[PDB]
Design a binder for this molecule. Structure first.
Ligand SMILES: Nc1ncnc2c1ncn2[C@@H]1O[C@H](CSCC[C@H](N)C(=O)O)[C@@H](O)[C@H]1O
Length: 332
RNA sequence: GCGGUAGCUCAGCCUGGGAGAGCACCGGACUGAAGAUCCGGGUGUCGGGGGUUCAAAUCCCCCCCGC
């Protein structure tokens, strides 16, 4: 808590000098008069070593909204070590609050609302289980609801996280798939959920996309999502309520197939059977098996009489040494 | 009348002086369950131009783009 006195004509030069060495105090705020300007500094010793006049005065603390804080900043060391990455989906804030530390859950709550004020629901995070891949979520703060509208890559996505699968992070993958698509192709997305992949693909390109999903409430909020985005999309989307393994054999074929396969499911043969130009097949593979995974894909390609180039890439960390991966199959 | 800030979603603007958050993305680590977790990295024309000022993301004017 101390300051720098500089002539107003030199105020800017001193300012960026202090930035250059790095002793300007961002927590406080600078006072000025017609004669001089005072800048708060972190260390006076290097201020005088640079040869500046150093003064001790009370400078106003800045509003907290203007102080750069992270989630580690506002939490004791121990329970931050225990946490617990934060993910925000619309109005819901989802975090993994470990079981040892739930008393500081309430302290945790404050931090999140100090970090994100516009969020109305804070929920504790479990795992994905069952066959709709719904994740275990319980609300530790706020409005007792698990549904909200979420913005991603320019689209609106209605999600009730207690009845459907949705992961915000896959936004990255979605944009990238959206970029591989070319205008005019017909695309099939099995296991489409609340159609985030359709909505993003059609958001950035003029295509027709078929979406197949089995969860009836997921098709409900896919409907509502398409209504929500009707004036936003360049392409067209059609939603099919059904089982992929029953629905797909009766559909026509598609330029590109994007299969976010559910954990444990083998849809490689079917989805590849419905593709002529591109298949993007997601799977869960341990690192040391990744190359074998590729051979499996190549095997299936030649079982269908297709000539393909196959490249598999890591998409995300699923569990220790296991990655969510995608096989890009280019059919010739 | 509002809104345009990192790749996405957004704080910061009232009342001028640190380019920030979460996630994405890149690199690395981690044996049973895990759509995880750990460590490192900011990748920016604050839509653009002008004005006031020692100094503009912030205040004023004009232009562009979407409700
Ligand atoms: N046999 C089947 N037919 C159609 N959909 C299925 C299915 N088995 C599971 N699903 C659905 O496929 C989804 C897998 S997770 C959803 C992924 C979605 N594309 C997204 O990125 O959000 C789940 O919603 C699940 O309900």
């Amino acid at each position: 808590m101390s300051g720098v006195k500089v002539r107003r004509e030199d105020a800017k030069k001193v300012l960026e000098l202090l930035k250059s060495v790095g002793i300007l105090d961002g927590k406080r705020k600078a006072i000025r008069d017609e004669k001089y300007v005072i800048f708060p500094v972190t260390d006076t010793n290097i201020a005088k070593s640079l040869g500046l006049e150093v003064v001790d005065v009370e400078l106003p603390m800045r509003p907290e909204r203007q102080i750069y804080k992270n989630l580690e900043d506002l939490l004791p060391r121990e329970i931050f070590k225990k946490l617990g990455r934060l993910d925000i989906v619309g109005d819901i804030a989802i975090v993994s609050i470990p079981d040892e530390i739930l008393s500081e859950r309430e302290v945790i709550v404050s931090a999140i609302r100090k970090l994100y004020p516009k969020v109305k629901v804070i929920a504790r995070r479990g795992f994905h289980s069952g066959l709709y891949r719904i994740r275990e979520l319980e609300v530790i703060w706020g409005e007792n609801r698990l549904h909200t509208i979420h913005k991603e890559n320019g689209v609106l996505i209605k999600v009730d996280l207690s009845k459907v699968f949705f992961n915000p992070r896959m936004k990255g993958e979605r944009y990238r798939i959206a970029q591989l698509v070319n205008d005019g192709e017909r695309i099939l997305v099995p296991f489409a959920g609340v159609i985030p992949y359709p909505l993003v693909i059609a958001r950035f390109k003029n295509v027709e996309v078929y979406a197949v999903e089995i969860n009836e409430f997921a098709v409900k909020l896919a409907e509502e999502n398409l209504e929500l985005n009707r004036d936003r999309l360049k392409g067209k989307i059609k939603i099919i309520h059904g089982d992929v393994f029953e629905v797909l054999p009766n559909l026509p074929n598609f330029d590109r197939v994007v299969s976010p396969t559910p954990k444990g499911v083998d849809a490689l043969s079917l989805t590849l059977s419905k593709a002529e130009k591109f298949l993007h097949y997601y799977d869960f593979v341990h690192e040391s098996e990744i190359e074998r995974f590729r051979e499996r894909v190549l095997e299936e390609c030649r079982r269908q009489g297709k000539e393909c180039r196959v490249s598999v890439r890591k998409v995300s960390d699923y569990k220790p040494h296991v990655y969510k991966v995608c096989a890009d199959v280019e059919i010739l």
